[PDB]
């Protein structure tokens, strides 16, 4: 009956959970990026050391200001973008809680049941006539 035809919530609820999942996924991806960034930094540092080391060796044989420029530019860019994305993730998560409001049980459920019941009454009246 119309009472048992109120399982549309189970799809609507689905949508709800789906959003959360997607939201979480966003967070997940962000974390990964952040970690990569740190790893990137590590590699960068190592490279410098290696370069430093080779300089020593090269100096042993005797007796740049643009690679670092773009390195620092893109590093500050990634840091600013990670800050913006973390703020956006906080905002998205908080907006999702302010959306898990209403429904998911007896408020938005009986409303659907009653509307379906009215639709049924109208259809029965039309068929009878």
């Amino acid at each position, epitope marked *: 009956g119309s009472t048992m035809g109120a399982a549309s919530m189970t799809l609507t609820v689905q949508a709800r959970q789906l959003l959360s999942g997607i939201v979480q996924q966003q967070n997940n991806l962000l974390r990964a990026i952040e970690a990569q960034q740190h790893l990137l930094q590590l590699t960068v540092w190592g490279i410098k050391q290696l370069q430093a080391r080779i300089l020593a060796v090269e100096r042993y044989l005797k007796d740049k200001m643009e690679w670092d420029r773009e390195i620092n530019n893109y590093t500050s860019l990634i840091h600013s973008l990670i800050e913006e994305s973390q703020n956006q993730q906080e905002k998205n998560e*908080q907006e999702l*809680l302010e959306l898990d*409001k209403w429904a998911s*049980l007896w*408020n938005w459920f009986n409303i659907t049941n009653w509307l379906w019941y009215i639709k049924l009454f109208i259809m029965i009246v039309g068929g009878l006539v």
Partner: nanobody
Amino acid sequence: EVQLVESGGGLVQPGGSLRLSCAASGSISSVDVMSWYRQAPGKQRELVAFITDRGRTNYKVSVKGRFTISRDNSKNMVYLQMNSLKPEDTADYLCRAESRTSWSSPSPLDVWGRGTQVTVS
């Protein structure tokens, strides 16, 4: 119209526990949602947790597993148990009564409190 009063605030060492209490004037058994927010100096008013008239509880991502919202309809009370507090949890905490329009409420209920301060340092 219901009126909300916060209590139970104070300062606590990082890792301590507190129990905030929103005392509502009227019976909140018919209030659709009772929510705990927090607001820090210079930051936004963050929704921390919320319970419904049917007991549906949900929390914030940074506080899930260490905050616990609960309700006592006999005392008309909404409690918020705070555990393992971080310095990030320092804010003036508010409680809000929300009620969308239904069959008994002609006007939507939107009541704020004056908040109790919670410091973790």
